[PDB]
Design a binder for these strands. Sequence first.
RNA 1: CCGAGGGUAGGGCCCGUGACUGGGGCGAAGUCGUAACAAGGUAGCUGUACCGGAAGGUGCGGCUGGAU
RNA 2: UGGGAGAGGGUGGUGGAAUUCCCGGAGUAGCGGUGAAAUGCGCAGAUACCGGGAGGAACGCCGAUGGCGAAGGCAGCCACCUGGUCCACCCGUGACGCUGAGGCGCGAAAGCGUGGGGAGCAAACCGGAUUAGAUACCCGGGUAGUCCACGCCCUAAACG
RNA 3: CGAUGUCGGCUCGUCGCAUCCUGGGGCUGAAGAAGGUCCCAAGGGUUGGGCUGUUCGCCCAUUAAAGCGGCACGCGAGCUG
RNA 4: GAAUGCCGGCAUGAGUAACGAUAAAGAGGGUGAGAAUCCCUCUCGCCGUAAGCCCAAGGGUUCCUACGCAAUGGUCGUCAGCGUAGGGUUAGGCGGGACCUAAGGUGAAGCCGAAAGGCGUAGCCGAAGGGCAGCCGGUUAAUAUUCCGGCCCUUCCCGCAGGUGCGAUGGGGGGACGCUCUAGGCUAGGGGGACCGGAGCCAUGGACGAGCCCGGCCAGAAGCGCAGGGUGGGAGGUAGGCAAAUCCGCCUCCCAACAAGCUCUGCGUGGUGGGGAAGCCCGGGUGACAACCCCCCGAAGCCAGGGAGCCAAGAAAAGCCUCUAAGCACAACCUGCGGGAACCCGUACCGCAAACCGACACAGGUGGGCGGGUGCAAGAGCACUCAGGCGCGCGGGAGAACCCUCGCCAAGGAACUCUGCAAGUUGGCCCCGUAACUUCGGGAGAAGGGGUGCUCCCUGGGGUGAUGAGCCCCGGGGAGCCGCAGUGAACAGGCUCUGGCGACUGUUUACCAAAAACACAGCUCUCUGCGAACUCGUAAGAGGAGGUAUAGGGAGCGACGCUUGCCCGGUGCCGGAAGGUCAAGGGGAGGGGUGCAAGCCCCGAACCGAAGCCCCGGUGAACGGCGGCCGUAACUAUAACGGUCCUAAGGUAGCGAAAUUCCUUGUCGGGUAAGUUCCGACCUGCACGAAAAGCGUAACGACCGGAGCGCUGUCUCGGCGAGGGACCCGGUGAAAUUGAACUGGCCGUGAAGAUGCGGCCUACCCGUGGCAGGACGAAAAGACCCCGUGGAGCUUUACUGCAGCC
RNA 5: GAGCUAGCCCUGGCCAGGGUGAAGCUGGGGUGAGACCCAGUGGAGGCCCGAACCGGUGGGGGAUGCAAACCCCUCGGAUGA
Lengths: 275, 48
Amino acid sequence: AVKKFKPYTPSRRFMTVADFSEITKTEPEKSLVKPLKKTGGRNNQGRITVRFRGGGHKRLYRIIDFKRWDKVGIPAKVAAIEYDPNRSARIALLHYVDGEKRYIIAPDGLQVGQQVVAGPDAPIQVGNALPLRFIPVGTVVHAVELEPKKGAKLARAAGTSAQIQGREGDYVILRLPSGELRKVHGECYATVGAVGNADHKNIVLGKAGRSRWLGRRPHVRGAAMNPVDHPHGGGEGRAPRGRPPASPWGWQTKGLKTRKRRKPSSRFIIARRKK
Amino acid sequence: MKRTWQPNRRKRAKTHGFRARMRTPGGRKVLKRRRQKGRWRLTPAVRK
RNA sequence: CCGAGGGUAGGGCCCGUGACUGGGGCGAAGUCGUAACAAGGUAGCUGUACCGGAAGGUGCGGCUGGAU
RNA sequence: UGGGAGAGGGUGGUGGAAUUCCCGGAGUAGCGGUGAAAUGCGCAGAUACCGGGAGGAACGCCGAUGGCGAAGGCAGCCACCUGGUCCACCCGUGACGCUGAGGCGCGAAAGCGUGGGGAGCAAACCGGAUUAGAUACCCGGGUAGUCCACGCCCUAAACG
RNA sequence: CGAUGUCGGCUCGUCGCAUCCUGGGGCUGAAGAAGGUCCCAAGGGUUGGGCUGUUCGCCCAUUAAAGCGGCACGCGAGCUG
RNA sequence: GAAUGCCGGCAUGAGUAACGAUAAAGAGGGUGAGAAUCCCUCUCGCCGUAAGCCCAAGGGUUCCUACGCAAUGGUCGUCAGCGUAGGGUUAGGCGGGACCUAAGGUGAAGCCGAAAGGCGUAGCCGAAGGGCAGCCGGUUAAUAUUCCGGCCCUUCCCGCAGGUGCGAUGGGGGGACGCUCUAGGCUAGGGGGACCGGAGCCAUGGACGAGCCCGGCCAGAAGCGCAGGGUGGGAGGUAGGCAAAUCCGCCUCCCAACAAGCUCUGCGUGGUGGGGAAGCCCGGGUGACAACCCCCCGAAGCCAGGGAGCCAAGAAAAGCCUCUAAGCACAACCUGCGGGAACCCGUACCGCAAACCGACACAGGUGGGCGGGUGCAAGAGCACUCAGGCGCGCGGGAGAACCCUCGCCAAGGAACUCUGCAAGUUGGCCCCGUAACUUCGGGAGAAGGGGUGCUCCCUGGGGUGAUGAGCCCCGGGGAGCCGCAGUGAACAGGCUCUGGCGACUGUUUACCAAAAACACAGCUCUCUGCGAACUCGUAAGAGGAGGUAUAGGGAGCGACGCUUGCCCGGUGCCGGAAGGUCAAGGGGAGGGGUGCAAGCCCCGAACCGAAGCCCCGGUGAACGGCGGCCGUAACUAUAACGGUCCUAAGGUAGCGAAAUUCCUUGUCGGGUAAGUUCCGACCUGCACGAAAAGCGUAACGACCGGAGCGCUGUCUCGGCGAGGGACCCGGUGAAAUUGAACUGGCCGUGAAGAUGCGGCCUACCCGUGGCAGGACGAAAAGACCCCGUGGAGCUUUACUGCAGCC
RNA sequence: GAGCUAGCCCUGGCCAGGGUGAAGCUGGGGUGAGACCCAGUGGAGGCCCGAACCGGUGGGGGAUGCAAACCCCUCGGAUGA
Ligand SMILES: CC(C)C[C@@H]1CCO[C@@H]2[C@H](CN[C@@H]2C(=O)N[C@H]2[C@H]3O[C@H](SC[C@H](F)C/C=C\[C@H]2C)[C@H](O)[C@@H](O)[C@H]3O)C1
Ligand SMILES: [Mg+2]
Ligand SMILES: [Mg+2]
Ligand SMILES: [Mg+2]
Ligand SMILES: [Mg+2]
Ligand SMILES: [Mg+2]
Ligand SMILES: [Mg+2]
Ligand SMILES: [Mg+2]
Ligand SMILES: [Mg+2]
Ligand SMILES: [Mg+2]
Ligand SMILES: [Mg+2]
Ligand SMILES: [Mg+2]
Ligand SMILES: [Mg+2]
Ligand SMILES: [Mg+2]
Ligand SMILES: [Mg+2]
Ligand SMILES: [Mg+2]
Ligand SMILES: [Mg+2]
Ligand SMILES: [Mg+2]
Ligand SMILES: [Mg+2]
Ligand SMILES: [Mg+2]
Ligand SMILES: [Mg+2]
Ligand SMILES: [Mg+2]
Ligand SMILES: [Mg+2]
Ligand SMILES: [Mg+2]
Ligand SMILES: [Mg+2]
Ligand SMILES: [Mg+2]
Ligand SMILES: [Mg+2]
Ligand SMILES: [Mg+2]
Ligand SMILES: [Mg+2]
Ligand SMILES: [Mg+2]
Ligand SMILES: [Mg+2]
Ligand SMILES: [Mg+2]
Ligand SMILES: [Mg+2]
Ligand SMILES: [Mg+2]
Ligand SMILES: [Mg+2]
Ligand SMILES: [Mg+2]
Ligand SMILES: [Mg+2]
Ligand SMILES: [Mg+2]
Ligand SMILES: [Mg+2]
Ligand SMILES: [Mg+2]
Ligand SMILES: [Mg+2]
Ligand SMILES: [Mg+2]
Ligand SMILES: [Mg+2]
Ligand SMILES: [Mg+2]
Ligand SMILES: [Mg+2]
Ligand SMILES: [Mg+2]
Ligand SMILES: [Mg+2]
Ligand SMILES: [Mg+2]
Ligand SMILES: [Mg+2]
Ligand SMILES: [Mg+2]
Ligand SMILES: [Mg+2]
Ligand SMILES: [Mg+2]
Ligand SMILES: [Mg+2]
Ligand SMILES: [Mg+2]
Ligand SMILES: [Mg+2]
Ligand SMILES: [Mg+2]
Ligand SMILES: [Mg+2]
Ligand SMILES: [Mg+2]
Ligand SMILES: [Mg+2]
Ligand SMILES: [Mg+2]
Ligand SMILES: [Mg+2]
Ligand SMILES: [Mg+2]
Ligand SMILES: [Mg+2]
Ligand SMILES: [Mg+2]
Ligand SMILES: [Mg+2]
Ligand SMILES: [Mg+2]
Ligand SMILES: [Mg+2]
Ligand SMILES: [Mg+2]
Ligand SMILES: [Mg+2]
Ligand SMILES: [Mg+2]
Ligand SMILES: [Mg+2]
Ligand SMILES: [Mg+2]
Ligand SMILES: [Mg+2]
Ligand SMILES: [Mg+2]
Ligand SMILES: [Mg+2]
Ligand SMILES: [Mg+2]
Ligand SMILES: [Mg+2]
Ligand SMILES: [Mg+2]
Ligand SMILES: [Mg+2]
Ligand SMILES: [Mg+2]
Ligand SMILES: [Mg+2]
Ligand SMILES: [Mg+2]
Ligand SMILES: [Mg+2]
Ligand SMILES: [Mg+2]
Ligand SMILES: [Mg+2]
Ligand SMILES: [Mg+2]
Ligand SMILES: [Mg+2]
Ligand SMILES: [Mg+2]
Ligand SMILES: [Mg+2]
Ligand SMILES: [Mg+2]
Ligand SMILES: [Mg+2]
Ligand SMILES: [Mg+2]
Ligand SMILES: [Mg+2]
Ligand SMILES: [Mg+2]
Ligand SMILES: [Mg+2]
Ligand SMILES: [Mg+2]
Ligand SMILES: [Mg+2]
Ligand SMILES: [Mg+2]
Ligand SMILES: [Mg+2]
Ligand SMILES: [Mg+2]
Ligand SMILES: [Mg+2]
Ligand SMILES: [Mg+2]
Ligand SMILES: [Mg+2]
Ligand SMILES: [Mg+2]
Ligand SMILES: [Mg+2]
Ligand SMILES: [Mg+2]
Ligand SMILES: [Mg+2]
Ligand SMILES: [Mg+2]
Ligand SMILES: [Mg+2]
Ligand SMILES: [Mg+2]
Ligand SMILES: [Mg+2]
Ligand SMILES: [Mg+2]
Ligand SMILES: [Mg+2]
Ligand SMILES: [Mg+2]
Ligand SMILES: [Mg+2]
Ligand SMILES: [Mg+2]
Ligand SMILES: [Mg+2]
Ligand SMILES: [Mg+2]
Ligand SMILES: [Mg+2]
Ligand SMILES: [Mg+2]
Ligand SMILES: [Mg+2]
Ligand SMILES: [Mg+2]
Ligand SMILES: [Mg+2]
Ligand SMILES: [Mg+2]
Ligand SMILES: [Mg+2]
Ligand SMILES: [Mg+2]
Ligand SMILES: [Mg+2]
Ligand SMILES: [Mg+2]
Ligand SMILES: [Mg+2]
Ligand SMILES: [Mg+2]
Ligand SMILES: [Mg+2]
Ligand SMILES: [Mg+2]
Ligand SMILES: [Mg+2]
Ligand SMILES: [Mg+2]
Ligand SMILES: [Mg+2]
Ligand SMILES: [Mg+2]
Ligand SMILES: [Mg+2]
Ligand SMILES: [Mg+2]
Ligand SMILES: [Mg+2]
Ligand SMILES: [Mg+2]
Ligand SMILES: [Mg+2]
Ligand SMILES: [Mg+2]
Ligand SMILES: [Mg+2]
Ligand SMILES: [Mg+2]
Ligand SMILES: [Mg+2]
Ligand SMILES: [Mg+2]
Ligand SMILES: [Mg+2]
Ligand SMILES: [Mg+2]
Ligand SMILES: [Mg+2]
Ligand SMILES: [Mg+2]
Ligand SMILES: [Mg+2]
Ligand SMILES: [Mg+2]
Ligand SMILES: [Mg+2]
Ligand SMILES: [Mg+2]
Ligand SMILES: [Mg+2]
Ligand SMILES: [Mg+2]
Ligand SMILES: [Mg+2]
Ligand SMILES: [Mg+2]
Ligand SMILES: [Mg+2]
Ligand SMILES: [Mg+2]
Ligand SMILES: [Mg+2]
Ligand SMILES: [Mg+2]
Ligand SMILES: [Mg+2]
Ligand SMILES: [Mg+2]
Ligand SMILES: [Mg+2]
Ligand SMILES: [Mg+2]
Ligand SMILES: [Mg+2]
Ligand SMILES: [Mg+2]
Ligand SMILES: [Mg+2]
Ligand SMILES: [Mg+2]
Ligand SMILES: [Mg+2]
Ligand SMILES: [Mg+2]
Ligand SMILES: [Mg+2]
Ligand SMILES: [Mg+2]
Ligand SMILES: [Mg+2]
Ligand SMILES: [Mg+2]
Ligand SMILES: [Mg+2]
Ligand SMILES: [Mg+2]
Ligand SMILES: [Mg+2]
Ligand SMILES: [Mg+2]
Ligand SMILES: [Mg+2]
Ligand SMILES: [Mg+2]
Ligand SMILES: [Mg+2]
Ligand SMILES: [Mg+2]
Ligand SMILES: [Mg+2]
Ligand SMILES: [Mg+2]
Ligand SMILES: [Mg+2]
Ligand SMILES: [Mg+2]
Ligand SMILES: [Mg+2]
Ligand SMILES: [Mg+2]
Ligand SMILES: [Mg+2]
Ligand SMILES: [Mg+2]
Ligand SMILES: [Mg+2]
Ligand SMILES: [Mg+2]
Ligand SMILES: [Mg+2]
Ligand SMILES: [Mg+2]
Ligand SMILES: [Mg+2]
Ligand SMILES: [Mg+2]
Ligand SMILES: [Mg+2]
Ligand SMILES: [Mg+2]
Ligand SMILES: [Mg+2]
Ligand SMILES: [Mg+2]
Ligand SMILES: [Mg+2]
Ligand SMILES: [Mg+2]
Ligand SMILES: [Mg+2]
Ligand SMILES: [Mg+2]
Ligand SMILES: [Mg+2]
Ligand SMILES: [Mg+2]
Ligand SMILES: [Mg+2]
Ligand SMILES: [Mg+2]
Ligand SMILES: [Mg+2]
Ligand SMILES: [Mg+2]
Ligand SMILES: [Mg+2]
Ligand SMILES: [Mg+2]
Ligand SMILES: [Mg+2]
Ligand SMILES: [Mg+2]
Ligand SMILES: [Mg+2]
Ligand SMILES: [Mg+2]
Ligand SMILES: [Mg+2]
Ligand SMILES: [Mg+2]
Ligand SMILES: [Mg+2]
Ligand SMILES: [Mg+2]
Ligand SMILES: [Mg+2]
Ligand SMILES: [Mg+2]
Ligand SMILES: [Mg+2]
Ligand SMILES: [Mg+2]
Ligand SMILES: [Mg+2]
Ligand SMILES: [Mg+2]
Ligand SMILES: [Mg+2]
Ligand SMILES: [Mg+2]
Ligand SMILES: [Mg+2]
Ligand SMILES: [Mg+2]
Ligand SMILES: [Mg+2]
Ligand SMILES: [Mg+2]
Ligand SMILES: [Mg+2]
Ligand SMILES: [Mg+2]
Ligand SMILES: [Mg+2]
Ligand SMILES: [Mg+2]
Ligand SMILES: [Mg+2]
Ligand SMILES: [Mg+2]
Ligand SMILES: [Mg+2]
Ligand SMILES: [Mg+2]
Ligand SMILES: [Mg+2]
Ligand SMILES: [Mg+2]
Ligand SMILES: [Mg+2]
Ligand SMILES: [Mg+2]
Ligand SMILES: [Mg+2]
Ligand SMILES: [Mg+2]
Ligand SMILES: [Mg+2]
Ligand SMILES: [Mg+2]
Ligand SMILES: [Mg+2]
Ligand SMILES: [Mg+2]
Ligand SMILES: [Mg+2]
Ligand SMILES: [Mg+2]
Ligand SMILES: [Mg+2]
């Protein structure tokens, strides 16, 4: 439920902030946080390899449990729902009856005080995690492993989910957040429900400095540069593209497909994405 | 106005020091050349 | 002290007028088409939307004040 | 107090028919369309037929000259929440009534905002016909929209 | 071309006369007044403003008149820009 | 003898410019061969959120003392950051190391690369971050939290006592954290005192006073007090914290809970140890048995790991505590106490500057802390002042032009000019009051006005204290006084109307452009299913991201509002298992060479044979593009209408002489006495037009345009005055430039603009202050222009390669 | 060679004083319940004014400079990109 501001500054006109109404705890679990090495887009050579990065707020990384088949059959209680600055989803704190404490991505609907459980036997309930094969067809699911025991890979951002469409041998057919239809192996785990905080996409950053807080440095158009810099650079006055619109490195950037031709996973993609 | 030389003993020893030169093929050629030329100092002085 | 009024500054309402511009009314015999009245030759009207020299047309939903 | 009928409203489920698209099979010289055609589609294998799948929308028969609502309006089926209303008994209150400038709420369609959805249909638009013309009627396409949520708009041959 | 700074303005002048005014004339289709045209004449004079970077030009208000040209389209080791 | 030659020397310019902030000097005494310049005294001025004081860098003896003055010092010099010599820097507690980790760096394992080398988990290094024990005073010419004095403390070793399951690089707890706002209580610091201490003072008309002037504290162990921080206790279960665990985590039960207790800091007090002014007298002595007290103000510092709110969600590791494992429980560890032990490096001095970075004793640059008082609403602003530190290392005169910086100006008031450029005006606070428009915030300090000192009287509330007095803080009313004038000095908006552009705050060409440019939230297209795409790299490996389509890359557009039309023929991209073409390879009809021959060797057609291209489609917020001629209405004119050619389609809405309009100062209207600019219209748009977005838009802008009011030395049109220079004298003393010079005007001549040639004219020799017409003056081997089969950046459907991708 | 300058990473530090007065909260009003209104409290913001600090808009000076970019007056930001 995005929060608005009155227009008492030029920027407060349009700025919207998340309501934080599901958050029940506001400092993280000390045993589950570790320092997040900020990069600024620089690789091990020190070269910028992803432009316009750096300068964002400091962050601690919350270790997230993307396996859950770690602890089959062991119920846990949802102790808290917490803000995670490293991802769009919120995160839920789990207290296992083990005494072990872990973080999961917080699905929509999940409540503090309810219990979740992982395993082939687990009830089909929001927050439980089962192998894909034991989830009934038609079930909305998130935090999906792409390959068995390799870790949850798909549908992790706020509001996203995959839907189960059917089974075909050892595999299930998922409709991913992108609308692609893909065969994912049935022993891959998934968590029942959609990821929460679906209002994330309606946040209006509102001002330039808000992008700066997030580590996003200003992005400068090719058309603003010189020919030394960019295909779209130069010209007297403004200039249209004057050639097929291109990236700084010369490749076409309006339509040109880029998935590797002979990639082995093509056997498992049924239909490319939609809209 | 702020000029270009802003001395700093740690910066000097770590950039041009003896150990910086020995760590690298190019740096060792520097020491080799300055020895062959007979330089009284192979490396800049800094008071550490 | 108050004080006719004069001065300075800023408001409100009304009247007249203005390059140009909007449509309206009227005007014996102009130009274009033929929308409506017969099922008016696509039943008509309608609120709305979009479009078209023009009347109009078309979409959606409504009315019979529609014929057979 | 005790009963009844009902597409009255809201929510969430869920059932089959049909259209479209995808896949597999089978099969070949046309299909479609009209007043007649053409555009379109089809040997790069269409149409027609069979099995599988996805998805949206609308609910055939019952169905009526029917029923419900204050009106706008409401139609598969199920459950829940809820309004109105009628009848019987003649039990309670004791005129506590009628209307109602303002106010408030409701208000078909189209339209608007933000998300979502999108099968069919279809303003705009394109093409094919027709015609003196044809910014139409007819044909092949087709974007909004038609659908859902929330928020607006507040119109009507909102009529008996 | 081992550089002769380029438009306009400002400042400062000085010169020519094919004279705008003022002085002297002849002719007039010169009654007077006022003009026209030509001759002599360079002593002095030849305004303020609106517009534009402007030179120029148009306009306002005047004036005896609001001259036209040369001086590296006078003048940036004088200024402006 | 020339090369703007090279090296050196020495001239010219010239006793010229200058002598480095306009904070400022004068006199007496002394020293000395010599004194504006050194020392001392008195007087004057300057800084005082510094121009004072303390750290950190960097510098490296510059520190102190004696003896010196050749050079260095912009003059002088007896002086000096200079020369010579001697002296000077003292630590278990300050800083760093024998402690910890951060980025990063390095790197057993391992990975990769022709070589060189590149990576890389642990580990190691790495600090201004974490951690850790010293405060006050005295002393030296020069060091001091270092020496000394007083009072405190830390670790290591060993011993004694008491206690305990002791024991770790392993487990756990803790360390451990943001931004804004902020409570209570304190401290630093400060103000006042009619109280306490003090050498003295009475002046010049008055004052012997509840007079003036000076000072009225600092550190301190335990204990105690005040204020805070941290922290539940017990039991039972237990499968998690990669072994174990009595610890931690999770479950349950009992009790405690805005407490308390325990613990830990801060402040206060505290044995004790110190300090102690003016003034006077020669840094010292005295004052002095110095006194050392009360009230008020009060932090941004402390208690602190405090509290609240918010979103952008805020290091690590060790010290420390707890758990246990090998082990070992004659040990070991814990607590107390005692004795012993306690290393290396730095320490001088400068440090907003004459000692650092700028070639200079250079008006520039340099991070942290302290930074007193009064008044002005506040404040680190401003004026003046304390402590402290300076008068800026050439002076003395004069009182021209001219220049700079500054003050004023009769009448006028933008007439100045490209332009109100510049300079006026306005200016703080309190109160009254405030428009279109608007996105309801704003526009707004709109505009425009009134008030402002001092005195007396009456009075309201708050803080401290006690509820009072005193002190302190916000006020209210009445009556008066003075001046030209009361934010009386200093610091402190001119305003309005209307266009263009850009939404806005931001960013930029270091050193000629700050803007309309870039960025920006927002909108759209597009790629990307994760070992993602993309990027850097030969690779390994990284980034992307410990992210996962509500995400990430690329591209354009640029808040917001209302919108974004038609063309897919060409180019691009997307789809298309057919067909055409298509390399290596397959195939081998059929030939050829050689050999006696078996053979060996060579050429080789059909046909099979990828991507790409052809071909069929799609696609515009992909590259792009969006017509011509002729005719027509009952006045004329003009054409709603028509004809025909052409195209892939012929520009829609909106806007338009525009940041675009050539003709052009279009035409008309407004504004002006007058308007090439401006605003409003018209539309024959040379040559607008819809995300290289179209049209608007409140608010914003050191943007660019037009107007008005206010006010002015901008101007008519200049005048006077101030200081710093210019000028003169003493000291010191450059520069570019320079073929040599005994270097005049005119009219001619000349390579076409002559001091230098001809003919005239004019002219005694040599300077000083000035002005800039000439020496085609200086400066820079023209940056425009061309030329060179000269170079370099950039582009592309130029050529040819290469990476990359297929 | 990044001791200048550009960006990023780690760790510290700094931003006098004054002004405006968002959300929320409380109370009150309102209603069937609401929305909502008013008052108080509150202290938000690439908010406002203005030092330090960071800039460099206009003009003047300087131009063999104090200075190979300085000086004076004026001006922009100053809790934030
Ligand atoms: C239509 C025009 C283009 C014709 C043109 C005009 C240019 O100038 C002349 C040329 C002929 N030669 C002339 C020439 O070269 N002037 C140069 C001058 O540069 C500076 S003046 C600072 C100026 F800002 C630069 C202006 C001029 C530079 C080039 C020197 O101090 C001067 O001595 C002098 O050298 C003719
Ligand atoms: Mg908002
Ligand atoms: Mg609002
Ligand atoms: Mg939430
Ligand atoms: Mg940790
Ligand atoms: Mg990283
Ligand atoms: Mg590395
Ligand atoms: Mg990149
Ligand atoms: Mg980057
Ligand atoms: Mg994310
Ligand atoms: Mg989150
Ligand atoms: Mg799989
Ligand atoms: Mg968004
Ligand atoms: Mg961030
Ligand atoms: Mg971004
Ligand atoms: Mg950009
Ligand atoms: Mg550009
Ligand atoms: Mg550019
Ligand atoms: Mg480059
Ligand atoms: Mg290139
Ligand atoms: Mg290029
Ligand atoms: Mg280009
Ligand atoms: Mg360009
Ligand atoms: Mg152009
Ligand atoms: Mg450009
Ligand atoms: Mg082009
Ligand atoms: Mg291209
Ligand atoms: Mg896909
Ligand atoms: Mg610099
Ligand atoms: Mg240098
Ligand atoms: Mg530096
Ligand atoms: Mg150093
Ligand atoms: Mg250092
Ligand atoms: Mg360094
Ligand atoms: Mg190095
Ligand atoms: Mg070194
Ligand atoms: Mg080598
Ligand atoms: Mg070697
Ligand atoms: Mg030697
Ligand atoms: Mg060396
Ligand atoms: Mg009167
Ligand atoms: Mg009709
Ligand atoms: Mg008809
Ligand atoms: Mg009809
Ligand atoms: Mg008809
Ligand atoms: Mg139509
Ligand atoms: Mg076939
Ligand atoms: Mg579908
Ligand atoms: Mg009864
Ligand atoms: Mg309605
Ligand atoms: Mg569709
Ligand atoms: Mg057609
Ligand atoms: Mg016909
Ligand atoms: Mg030339
Ligand atoms: Mg020369
Ligand atoms: Mg020249
Ligand atoms: Mg020259
Ligand atoms: Mg002038
Ligand atoms: Mg005359
Ligand atoms: Mg006459
Ligand atoms: Mg004359
Ligand atoms: Mg003119
Ligand atoms: Mg002209
Ligand atoms: Mg006359
Ligand atoms: Mg002339
Ligand atoms: Mg000429
Ligand atoms: Mg000419
Ligand atoms: Mg000239
Ligand atoms: Mg000239
Ligand atoms: Mg000049
Ligand atoms: Mg000139
Ligand atoms: Mg000259
Ligand atoms: Mg000259
Ligand atoms: Mg010779
Ligand atoms: Mg020379
Ligand atoms: Mg030479
Ligand atoms: Mg020579
Ligand atoms: Mg030489
Ligand atoms: Mg020489
Ligand atoms: Mg010699
Ligand atoms: Mg010499
Ligand atoms: Mg001389
Ligand atoms: Mg002289
Ligand atoms: Mg001279
Ligand atoms: Mg000089
Ligand atoms: Mg000088
Ligand atoms: Mg000064
Ligand atoms: Mg001065
Ligand atoms: Mg003297
Ligand atoms: Mg002297
Ligand atoms: Mg002397
Ligand atoms: Mg002196
Ligand atoms: Mg002295
Ligand atoms: Mg005296
Ligand atoms: Mg002071
Ligand atoms: Mg000497
Ligand atoms: Mg001397
Ligand atoms: Mg001497
Ligand atoms: Mg000597
Ligand atoms: Mg000297
Ligand atoms: Mg000097
Ligand atoms: Mg002597
Ligand atoms: Mg010493
Ligand atoms: Mg010691
Ligand atoms: Mg040791
Ligand atoms: Mg270490
Ligand atoms: Mg190895
Ligand atoms: Mg190699
Ligand atoms: Mg290191
Ligand atoms: Mg270390
Ligand atoms: Mg340290
Ligand atoms: Mg220490
Ligand atoms: Mg101590
Ligand atoms: Mg001594
Ligand atoms: Mg913590
Ligand atoms: Mg933390
Ligand atoms: Mg920290
Ligand atoms: Mg924050
Ligand atoms: Mg307080
Ligand atoms: Mg104290
Ligand atoms: Mg005080
Ligand atoms: Mg256990
Ligand atoms: Mg004493
Ligand atoms: Mg004594
Ligand atoms: Mg502070
Ligand atoms: Mg670490
Ligand atoms: Mg054992
Ligand atoms: Mg034993
Ligand atoms: Mg113990
Ligand atoms: Mg040692
Ligand atoms: Mg020392
Ligand atoms: Mg300074
Ligand atoms: Mg400092
Ligand atoms: Mg000094
Ligand atoms: Mg000096
Ligand atoms: Mg200096
Ligand atoms: Mg003040
Ligand atoms: Mg001085
Ligand atoms: Mg000074
Ligand atoms: Mg001086
Ligand atoms: Mg004189
Ligand atoms: Mg004055
Ligand atoms: Mg006066
Ligand atoms: Mg005057
Ligand atoms: Mg005036
Ligand atoms: Mg006036
Ligand atoms: Mg003017
Ligand atoms: Mg100008
Ligand atoms: Mg003034
Ligand atoms: Mg003022
Ligand atoms: Mg108005
Ligand atoms: Mg108003
Ligand atoms: Mg206005
Ligand atoms: Mg307006
Ligand atoms: Mg308003
Ligand atoms: Mg005012
Ligand atoms: Mg008053
Ligand atoms: Mg007075
Ligand atoms: Mg008076
Ligand atoms: Mg102001
Ligand atoms: Mg802007
Ligand atoms: Mg801009
Ligand atoms: Mg704009
Ligand atoms: Mg805008
Ligand atoms: Mg700002
Ligand atoms: Mg620049
Ligand atoms: Mg430049
Ligand atoms: Mg430069
Ligand atoms: Mg400039
Ligand atoms: Mg510029
Ligand atoms: Mg600016
Ligand atoms: Mg820019
Ligand atoms: Mg913008
Ligand atoms: Mg989008
Ligand atoms: Mg690469
Ligand atoms: Mg990572
Ligand atoms: Mg992106
Ligand atoms: Mg926009
Ligand atoms: Mg932009
Ligand atoms: Mg349109
Ligand atoms: Mg096309
Ligand atoms: Mg096409
Ligand atoms: Mg195409
Ligand atoms: Mg092929
Ligand atoms: Mg083109
Ligand atoms: Mg084209
Ligand atoms: Mg026009
Ligand atoms: Mg325009
Ligand atoms: Mg144009
Ligand atoms: Mg024009
Ligand atoms: Mg023109
Ligand atoms: Mg005109
Ligand atoms: Mg007019
Ligand atoms: Mg206009
Ligand atoms: Mg026209
Ligand atoms: Mg474009
Ligand atoms: Mg353009
Ligand atoms: Mg476009
Ligand atoms: Mg509007
Ligand atoms: Mg605007
Ligand atoms: Mg505006
Ligand atoms: Mg601006
Ligand atoms: Mg700005
Ligand atoms: Mg600006
Ligand atoms: Mg003057
Ligand atoms: Mg003077
Ligand atoms: Mg003399
Ligand atoms: Mg001399
Ligand atoms: Mg000398
Ligand atoms: Mg000679
Ligand atoms: Mg001679
Ligand atoms: Mg001579
Ligand atoms: Mg002569
Ligand atoms: Mg000639
Ligand atoms: Mg001549
Ligand atoms: Mg001569
Ligand atoms: Mg001669
Ligand atoms: Mg001769
Ligand atoms: Mg001769
Ligand atoms: Mg001669
Ligand atoms: Mg002669
Ligand atoms: Mg003569
Ligand atoms: Mg002289
Ligand atoms: Mg002279
Ligand atoms: Mg001259
Ligand atoms: Mg001259
Ligand atoms: Mg000359
Ligand atoms: Mg010459
Ligand atoms: Mg000359
Ligand atoms: Mg040369
Ligand atoms: Mg040349
Ligand atoms: Mg040159
Ligand atoms: Mg150039
Ligand atoms: Mg040429
Ligand atoms: Mg050639
Ligand atoms: Mg040639
Ligand atoms: Mg060439
Ligand atoms: Mg080249
Ligand atoms: Mg190659
Ligand atoms: Mg690629
Ligand atoms: Mg650097
Ligand atoms: Mg740096
Ligand atoms: Mg910081
Ligand atoms: Mg600040
Ligand atoms: Mg308030
Ligand atoms: Mg609150
Ligand atoms: Mg601000
Ligand atoms: Mg203000
Ligand atoms: Mg600067
Ligand atoms: Mg400046
Ligand atoms: Mg100025
Ligand atoms: Mg210069
Ligand atoms: Mg100033
Ligand atoms: Mg400000
Ligand atoms: Mg501030």
